[PDB]
From a paper:
The last remaining candidate gene encodes a PKS (PECPS) sharing high amino acid sequence identity with the other four PKSs, as well as the highest 93% similarity with AsCHS1, and this gene maintains the Cys-His-Asn catalytic triad conserved in all known type III PKSs. The crystal structure of PECPS showed typical homodimeric type III PKS folding.
The crystal structure of the A210E mutant enzyme revealed that the A210E substitution eliminated pocket B observed in the wild type PECPS structure by occupying a space corresponding to pocket B with the Glu210 side chain. The docking simulation also showed no critical movement of the side chains, including the apparent rotation of Asn199, even though the substrate and intermediate were located in the active site cavity.
Author numbering:
A (entry chain A), B (entry chain E): 6 to 394
């Protein structure tokens, strides 16, 4: 047993102290999206392509998606509705006028749950794949919120769908190595760089237009909680990034003049199914857990088939993925903020249903996300007793 | 004084264990650049414009700059030079083929100085404002170097010129909170997004065409050095980030279909002189240093006038900013990699000249970089005795 200076560092593991989410008011029901999509993109003459997009949208099990892009906005920026037209400047002007503001809606509510003054926030981690800004949205959010000008910011542009786990991994080290540090984690995502019209020669990319959506999630992360005034929800025990073998060019995205064009040539679900058991077994090794159904789950629902395959591969109870399947249905794929919507949903569900811990009665939990790499972010979570709340 | 169980954290401050630099082979003498620049862009008829560019290039106090872009490459990518055609795709293809490779050259040399196997690298921090890639250059560098697929990567896209300080600020928390962790810090920068013809620019952008250049820097950061195998060069004592008052939109870089178009509508040299004394007095507060000439200096030289202003303001010896001026004359503004270049030159110079410490004889040192915000990064450095080397 060894001891060191406390000095300017924190003592215990980093905890999630607050969670809130936000979405644009405008939304589209997935049943109505095909007819809306081919109308605003000037493609009502592509009849078979419209019918195929209808069948794609039904298989996604999505029911509602919030989007900043309205029929009005697409009219004033017709280049975004085209499949490939120079529109980065237009997409970026929308990103500048929405992404920081949407994160503010989530941060304000997350700070509200926190209950502590905003001047106590020492760090800010901001993830977005919806627009590269200089200065970034981390600066705009800091100005909109009124945070300290000396805050230590960390702007993460275009990491992909796995940046949700990357944010927690970063926040863990920031909170633990700095005594009194309170880390505002914000993931404000939108389909601004991805949205485009249908293509009779690129039908593979209609699938992405059927899943992505808009939404922001905000967390307060910190070590050494003041239990008189703060209420930990989870503990961030470990967080590891991994490049999967034989995954070259699995998810590729080129930032062109017409935004991001995601390249998906490799079967992601087969790739995850080959490696998820080994990755989760390494994350759970220190816990001693030996049953998959004795932990709570947070999986990034980027592709819906992975949820069914992972459930069948590990023989999971149909209820252990209820919160993941709820966010995918009510919100779709919000890039990196999706896993944090799922964590907030899993938290709210466990409390409202009278479960013994914020992890639905289970002590340990695993958060699993993925994106370009093929990169996987794995976070081991520890729930708190709901009686402490 | 309090004490905490060490567990899986590190005991001491983060140390710079090794550092190296790399540049593209091709370079242009600043006395030859105006004739080259206006010939390859077919602008030799704009005589009044070319004479202004000569007077601008002479004032930069630069003698050469290394650049990936050659006359053969510009002729093979005429979109980069053509005002009537988009060019972001051609620029990113060049970024994919050079930015990770340039970082590999700098990283391999730093690892050779380090002496330890690559498998002991646990974290990677990559900074670039020269190409948003998915997967990013952090993935590319990881594959080219053969680093562990389980490495904890942190890709920093398009943060601007201050990202040299940001990366040190990030590596400090990564190393100090993880015992045995070793962080590879790479900043690979180039002009692939800002380069364009002279008539395609305003006044402010024409000065950027005379200063920007290509180059990569690579450090090894880690706490608790094995003194049997490793040799610390500097210690990262503190690292803060600040937004300056009354600096809204002082530096803006808009990523468009023609590349990165910068904007500098405010007097950046005047902004720095207004706040540099107060910002550095807070960083030096726990050191007890009273005189400005009792420390070593690493100032970002993106605006050469700031060097001469800070020199007269703080009443510095002409010898103090020697290392900063050597890099500016020999390499120009290499975006975030410039300040790290200066840190390596300051080290090599102090060692070769027989100084007592790697800080040119002095104990404490400040590193100061700036970019869009107006953001200021500030690192407090502690030198080591050269007799240990």
């Amino acid at each position: 047993v060894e001891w060191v200076r406390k000095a300017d560092r924190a003592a215990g593991p980093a905890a999630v102290l607050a969670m809130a989410t936000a979405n644009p008011s405008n939304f589209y029901l997935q049943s109505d999206f095909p007819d809306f999509y081919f109308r605003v993109t000037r493609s009502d003459h592509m009849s078979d392509l419209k019918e195929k997009f209808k069948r794609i949208c039904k298989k996604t099990t999505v029911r509602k998606r919030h989007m900043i892009l309205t029929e009005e906005i697409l009219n004033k920026n017709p280049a975004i509705a085209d499949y490939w037209s120079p529109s980065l400047a237009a997409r970026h002007d929308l990103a500048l006028a929405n992404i920081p503001q949407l994160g503010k809606e989530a941060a304000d509510k997350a700070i509200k749950e926190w209950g502590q003054p905003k001047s106590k926030i020492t760090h800010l981690v901001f993830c977005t794949s919806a627009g590269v800004l200089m200065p970034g949205a981390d600066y705009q959010l800091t100005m909109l919120l009124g945070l300290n000008p000396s805050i230590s910011r960390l702007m993460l542009h275009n990491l992909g769908c796995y940046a949700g786990g990357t944010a927690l991994r970063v926040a863990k080290d920031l909170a633990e190595n700095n005594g009194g540090a309170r880390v505002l984690v914000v993931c404000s995502e939108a389909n601004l760089l991805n949205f485009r019209g249908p293509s009779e020669t690129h039908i593979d990319e209609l699938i992405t237009q059927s899943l992505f959506a808009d939404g922001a999630a905000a967390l307060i992360v910190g070590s050494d909680p003041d239990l008189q005034t703060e209420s930990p929800l989870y503990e961030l025990i470990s967080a590891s990034q991994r490049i999967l073998p034989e995954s070259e060019d699995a998810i590729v995205g080129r930032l062109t003049e017409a935004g991001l064009v995601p390249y998906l040539p490799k079967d992601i679900p087969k790739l995850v199914s080959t490696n998820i058991r080994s990755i989760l077994e390494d994350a759970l090794a220190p816990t001693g857990v030996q049953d998959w159904n004795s932990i709570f789950w947070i999986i990034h629902p980027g592709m819906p088939a992975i949820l069914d395959q992972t459930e069948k591969l590990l023989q999971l109870d149909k209820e252990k993925l209820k919160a993941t399947r709820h966010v995918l249905s009510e919100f779709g794929n919000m890039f990196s903020a999706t896993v944090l919507f799922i964590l907030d949903q899993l938290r709210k569900g466990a409390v409202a249903e009278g479960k013994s811990t914020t992890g639905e009665g289970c002590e340990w939990g695993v958060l699993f996300s993925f994106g370009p790499g093929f990169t996987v972010e794995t976070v081991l979570l520890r729930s708190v007793a709901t009686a402490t709340l």
